[PDB]
Amino acid sequence: RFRKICVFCGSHSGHREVFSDAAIELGNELVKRKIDLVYGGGSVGLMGLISRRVYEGGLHVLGIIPKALMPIEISGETVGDVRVVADMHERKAAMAQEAEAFIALPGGYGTMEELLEMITWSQLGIHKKTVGLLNVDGYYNNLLALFDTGVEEGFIKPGARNIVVSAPTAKELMEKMEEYT
Amino acid sequence: QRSRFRKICVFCGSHSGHREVFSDAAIELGNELVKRKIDLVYGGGSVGLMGLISRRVYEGGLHVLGIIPKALMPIEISGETVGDVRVVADMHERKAAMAQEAEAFIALPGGYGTMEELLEMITWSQLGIHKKTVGLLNVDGYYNNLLALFDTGVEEGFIKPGARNIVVSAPTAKELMEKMEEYT
Prior knowledge:
The structure is a homodimer.
Chain A: E1 4-8, H1 18-32, E2 36-39, H2 45-56, E3 61-66, H3 70-73, E4 81-85, H4 88-98, E5 101-104, H5 109-123, E6 130-134, H6 141-153, H7 158-161, E7 164-167, H8 170-179
Parallel strand pairs in A: 1-2, 1-5, 2-3, 3-4, 5-6, 6-7
Helix pairs in contact in A: 1-2
EC number (chain B): 3.2.2.n1
Subcellular location (chain B): Cytoplasm; Nucleus
Keywords (chain B): Cytokinin biosynthesis, Cytoplasm, Hydrolase, Nucleus
């Protein structure tokens, strides 16, 4: 049972509506389960969608954003709390300290980087926190295929392949991570 | 031969891979760095692909700088060190110190840690944090799925066309070095 989850996503929504739908459904899963959100502070793209949902649903949202990234990711009007940090490393360390587990929605390089980093910290024993991915309409199939390649070629151990929990919908992913060990 | 680069950081890990082709690739990239008179920045390991590429560059008479968090030393360092070792506090100092020391980055095949380092440096180019060439040595299609994932990000609207070309890619060290020279 979680109280704080960090969700990685970016300031784009995707061309197809299935992505926003996922972000909203994940926001609603966190609301129903009374889970607070930790995220990157943006107010557009999937970041704005999920944080507004959670915030408007009554749960706490904490964004964590570096100073120089604010004019880029925050437009319009924020909701919930925003912690401002010095740089990208402080952002990653603060998001990790604040969360009990991690979920990547679809996103570009930033989101993939954050997710890979959390998987790495689990693999190294740095923390024991669950890492999931919401594999919206196969967006992450190539990522999981890559992990499979890594296992097959001898760069990732079979047991470490199992750190990543994934599912095609927010509902199924939440069930899976409530039950992961 | 002439190069724009004097210092390159190579991401790779403590395993060599089950097939020989991955070790051959690390050695070929070591050879290409030596031919261009390029110094190596890397993670300080002495085993796996990190041990192969660092030993080849050292043996060829170029400088090797390893940057390793103190708690990984017992784990990534074995037998002997290769080149000089700079010890840092944690993962983030290691990443910051490797970027600061390098003019460009190359990922060899590796597991999660190498993937994450590679994606961070791409993200940093995309953001304007730095203006440094990022390459991956796609040994025998190893990174085909990550490049396909980058294509998926473009097609679905999460990565702009221009940001897709940040990642320079080739299947051999020689072709990779050539494409990185020419990147703009």
